[PDB]
């Protein structure tokens, strides 16, 4: 049936125990938040930012979507981004992908004629896919999957650094770091894919694509 | 400072501890997921569904965005909805507001001219607000804010119920329930705000706006 | 066949004759534009702004979409809007709907379970539809159609006036007028539906919905 | 001054004159349309397709936006595409750039941090640009600009060809052609920039990016 009681009971029991252990647990954040992190990751049920990073409420503001995609043209994601950088002044942006990611697999195998919105949505994976024909072809179904997940992370990290929000934030001395990481559903573990990026100079050193040229294109002409 | 091992270490501990409490915790999801719930909640750092419902991985699919908004025209949220209803066949949609929600307050206070993407993104909140002008007219700041949060949850439940994905699932005799819940950051407590909605009938009984009339409007033309 | 030659020939013959009649016809706008109008109307093949208003190149900048819809959350439309108000400094915004509009009919009759993107897209028509149960019910299929087209015009005019672009433009003394009009495919004719709106005071007088309250909501509380 | 009769009068004259040249000009479309073309062009005031192609009403369905961009994820343009391909069964998609396009220049010159929605919207242009960095590296301002316009038209042709709506039409043996055209505001002249594309074959022959590989990428995995 559709009854919520065992869900709510489970909630109750959880909140009961947290306040028991630390009394200000909830009350400190009853009227405000001051998270340090923004996390962008996949909507996937195996990937709970707070749980995997063992965080308590108030620590990590979270955008989650299918494929952990970041696009200037997505107001959903860009809103979580604007708000946390400009208003909450967070310090760290975690861009998190995960092995076994359906959106990455779908991005690899589907035929664009596939119907529905998920397929509209994952067009960004296809774009990353297309730029890396060389890292992907003649790899096993499984290695391709893993590679695709990582390339996506790296592409999304780029997108975050190139976002007008992060770029305006850098232009005004606000400390903002951006981090490419990956999670393994089968192990609970997080490895760092790209070392911390804290401004242009870092991105120049750490990102395959050229952010400087992206930012200053006309400097590349006559 | 932006190092990340601290965190990375906290992840390790967590994953070992869980692997200690249970040997097949992570391993049983290495290569699939069968969650029963899709959750749509605020990206607010205080409100981590898997945590607050004491769920383990593989249990809840999560869309999180600024103001827990659901729109047919937002491909971000729509693809979480399609992929869970259609590929994953989840049984329960949780639509969760939370008190002290900045998006809800911003929808009461900002002038539409404010700049930025957040302001654009929370246009839906203003629309819920304009539609309920009278319920809100008169109340104190604090009261209005709380009322907005609640009207918003109800409006977002309605929008999930009215979405193409859900109507199509209902017309296909898919078992699928939709829940209006709110959460009190200052307490860790979730309260059911709207009883379970499992189809048109439930919704005709339970919602302040007319789903039937939304779904069959032309039947009432001459 | 797919050959363009009769299309290009037709173009050629057209450009030939225009330059023949007036030599600066094209050349004056070869390197720039200074249009006075922005037109927002339907993608419908019977509704060619320049032709119906007998305009020459450089006069009217044009957004056209299915249903002539205006939404803060649509970057396509909002871009045409931002650009012409902020950069080109246009004076007049024409919001134009048209009888026999499919998007309006579809908005009336379809069941939201309908598949595809057009149905996602016209959700705004349904929203206007829902607010006007009273002006529409027990009207003939045809009168309902016509009414729905007009209500949409009026709703879109509101949306344009409430847009952050138009609102910021008003706040800085920039003269900007907004106009609700309608076109008849079967007659070539344009009637004015709403008299010119040139700022708040006008909208207050000319729009059914309350723009002032929309702009200053908190002034409606305690 | 914002009166509107002037215009309204020009509309009258036009409509009488056309009704003079032909008695059933408007009347034959009063209650239907069967255009053969969908046109996707810049919202630029200088570029009115029905006018420049000397088409009468009922002949061209029109999407117009800032930079003639086509994205699977833009429901605005996508619904023009779906409704024309699927309901109307048009035969020819015209994808039209134009020289002296501000969006194309903005995609060369702006810094991603610029503010506003336009800048967000033209992210696609920057992506076409980054992908062709080398073709553009070195050229004069004037030359680059022209080159951007042309790379953009080709990229947008590719995106129409790769869209779900078109691939699905092609796989259904629908006759459907896609054309890359550019237009010179200073002359009234359209030039064919890419020969007609009527299916995969055409596109494999005619496009600089690999449609086949985009459509069947996984076939090249081990
Ligand atoms: Cl979460
Ligand atoms: Cl046009
Ligand atoms: Zn995933
Ligand atoms: Zn919130
Ligand atoms: Zn129409
Ligand atoms: Zn242009």
How big is the CA angle at B212 (ends B210 and B217), to the nearest 5 degrees? 95
Rounded to whole angstroms, the Cα distance separating B81 from B90 reads: 10
A177: closest CA of chain D, how far (Å):
17
The pair of structure tokens assigned to A101 is 């990611």
Q: Please report where in the chains the tokens 């960095």 appear, as a residue.
A: D133
User: What is the arrangement of strands in the sheet containing C177-184, beginning at the earlier edge strand?
Assistant: C189-197, C177-184, C92-98, C37-42, C60-65, D60-65, D37-42, D92-98, D177-184, D189-197
* Stated resolution in angstroms: 2.5
Q: Is B178 exposed, middle or buried (0-12, 13-18, 19+ CB in 10 A)?
A: buried
Q: Is A82 exposed, middle or buried (0-12, 13-18, 19+ CB in 10 A)?
A: buried
The pair of structure tokens assigned to A113 is 């004629």
List the single residue in D with minimal CA-CA distance to A171: D113
Residue in D119, D110, D98 with CA at minimum distance from that of residue D45: D98
List the single residue in A with minimal CA-CA distance to C120: A117
Rounded to whole angstroms, the Cα distance separating D14 from D222 reads: 64
The pair of structure tokens assigned to C183 is 């076109």
DSSP D154-166: HHHHHHHHHSHHH
Helix (H), strand (E) at residue A8: helix A5-21
Rounded to whole angstroms, the Cα distance separating D50 from D27 reads: 18
Rounded to whole angstroms, the Cα distance separating D2 from C204 reads: 17
Task: Kindly list the partner chains of chain B, i.e. chains with 3 or more CB atom pairs below 8 Å.
Answer: A, C, D
In angstroms and rounded to an integer, the radius of gyration of the C-alpha atoms of chain D is 19
Q: Is D209 exposed, middle or buried (0-12, 13-18, 19+ CB in 10 A)?
A: middle
Q: Residue C158: which residues within 8 A CB-CB, separation 6 or more?
A: C203, C207, C209, C211
Q: Which positions in chain C touch D60 (Cβ < 8 Å)?
A: 45, 48
Rounded to whole angstroms, the Cα distance separating D1 from B130 reads: 32
Q: Is residue B109 within 8 Å of residue B126, measured between CB atoms?
A: no
Q: Which ligand is nearest to the CA of D145?
A: 6
Q: Is residue C96 within 8 Å of residue C183, measured between CB atoms?
A: yes
Best mutation target among A31, A79, A95, A193 (most B Cβ atoms within 10 Å) is A79
Rounded to whole angstroms, the Cα distance separating D171 from D178 reads: 15
C-beta atoms surrounding A89 within 10 Å? 14
Task: Say yes or no for a CB contact (<8 Å) between D48 and C55.
Answer: yes
Rounded to whole angstroms, the Cα distance separating C70 from C162 reads: 10
Residue in C220, C210, C94 with CA at minimum distance from that of residue C157: C94
For domain B1-222, the CATH class is alpha beta
Beta bridge partners of D92: D37, D177
Residue in B201, B134, B218, B203 with CA at minimum distance from that of residue C133: B218
Beta bridge partners of B179: B94
Backbone φ and ψ for A37, nearest 5 degrees, come out as -105, 145
Beta bridge partners of B40: B63, B95
Beta bridge partners of C38: C61, C93
A166: closest CA of chain D, how far (Å):
8
Q: Is residue B50 within 8 Å of residue B60, measured between CB atoms?
A: yes
Task: Say yes or no for a CB contact (<8 Å) between A121 and B26.
Answer: no
List the single residue in C with minimal CA-CA distance to B209: C130
D183: left (phi over 0), alpha (psi -120 to 50) or beta: beta
Residue in B201, B203, B159, B164 with CA at minimum distance from that of residue B86: B164
The pair of structure tokens assigned to A61 is 């503001």
At A222, is the secondary structure helix, strand, or coil? coil
Q: Is residue C161 within 8 Å of residue C211, measured between CB atoms?
A: yes
Pairing mode of beta strands A177-184, A189-197: antiparallel
Rounded to whole angstroms, the Cα distance separating A71 from A63 reads: 13
The pair of structure tokens assigned to A78 is 């860009």
Residue in C158, C168, C166 with CA at minimum distance from that of residue C208: C158
Active site (annotated) includes residue D101: yes
Rounded to whole angstroms, the Cα distance separating C17 from A133 reads: 50
**From residue D31, how far is each of C32, C106, C147, D26 by CA, in Å?**
39, 15, 16, 10
DSSP D56: P
Q: What's the CA-to-centroid distance between A174 and ligand 3, angstroms? A: 31
**From residue B46, how far is each of A29, A166, C29 by CA, in Å?**
7, 23, 56
Rounded to whole angstroms, the Cα distance separating C45 from D61 reads: 4
Rounded to whole angstroms, the Cα distance separating C125 from C19 reads: 42
Task: Say yes or no for a CB contact (<8 Å) between B74 and C73.
Answer: yes
Q: Is residue D65 within 8 Å of residue D39, measured between CB atoms?
A: no
Task: Say yes or no for a CB contact (<8 Å) between A164 and D119.
Answer: yes
Active site residues of C: 42, 44, 46, 98, 101
Residue in C115, C135, C125, C148 with CA at minimum distance from that of residue C71: C125
> Considering only CB atoms, which residues of chain B are within 8 Å of chain D?
73, 75, 115, 117, 120
C-beta atoms surrounding D164 within 10 Å? 22
Q: Is residue D186 within 8 Å of residue D100, measured between CB atoms?
A: yes
Rounded to whole angstroms, the Cα distance separating D170 from D173 reads: 5
The pair of structure tokens assigned to C79 is 């871009």
At D37, is the secondary structure helix, strand, or coil? strand
Q: Residue A24: which residues within 8 A CB-CB, separation 6 or more?
A: none
Q: Is residue A53 within 8 Å of residue A60, measured between CB atoms?
A: yes
Long-range CB pairs of C101-105 (<8 Å, 24+ gap) are: C101/C42, C101/C44, C101/C67, C101/C145, C101/C149, C101/C152, C102/C44, C102/C66, C102/D83, C102/D87, C103/C42, C103/C66, C103/C67, C103/C68, C103/C69, C104/C67, C104/C145, C104/C148, C104/C149, C104/C152, C105/C145, C105/C148
Helix (H), strand (E) at residue C90: none
Please pick, among B77, B96, B101, B161, the residue that the annotation labels catalytic.
B101
3-state secondary structure chain B: CCCCHHHHHHHHHHHHHHHHHCCCCCHHHCCCCCCCEEEEEECCCCCCHHHHCCCCCCCEEEEEECCCCCCCCCHHHHHHHHHHHHHCCCCEEEEEEECCCHHHHHHHHCCCCCCCHHHHHCHHHHHHHHHCHHHHCCCCHHHHHHHHHHHHHHHHHHHHHHCHHHHHHHCCCCCCEEEEEEEECCCCEEEEEEEEECCHHHHHHHCCCCHHHHHCHHHHCC
C74: closest CA of chain A, how far (Å):
9
């Amino acid at each position: 049936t559709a009854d919520l009681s065992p869900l709510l009971e489970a909630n109750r029991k959880w909140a009961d125990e947290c306040a028991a252990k630390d009394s200000t647990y909830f009350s400190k954040v009853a009227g405000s938040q001051a998270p340090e992190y923004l996390y962008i990751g996949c909507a996937d049920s195996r990937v709970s930012p707070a749980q995997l990073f063992n965080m308590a409420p108030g620590e990590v503001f979270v955008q989650r979507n299918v494929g952990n995609l970041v696009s200037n043209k997505d107001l959903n994601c860009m809103s979580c981004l604007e708000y946390t950088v400009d208003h909450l002044k967070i310090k760290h942006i975690l861009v998190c992908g995960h092995y076994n990611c359906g959106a990455c697999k779908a991005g690899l195998v589907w035929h664009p004629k596939t119907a529905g919105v998920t397929n509209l949505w994952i067009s960004d994976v296809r774009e990353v896919r297309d730029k890396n024909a060389a890292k992907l072809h003649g790899l096993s179904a499984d290695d391709a999957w893993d590679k695709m997940v990582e390339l996506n992370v790296e592409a999304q990290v780029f997108n975050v650094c190139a976002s007008p929000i992060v770029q305006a934030a850098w232009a005004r001395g606000q400390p903002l770091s951006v981090h490419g990481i990956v999670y393994t559903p089968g192990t609970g573990l997080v490895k760092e894919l790209i070392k911390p990026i804290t401004g242009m100079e870092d991105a120049g050193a750490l990102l395959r694509a050229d952010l400087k040229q992206h930012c200053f294109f006309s400097e590349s002409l006559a």
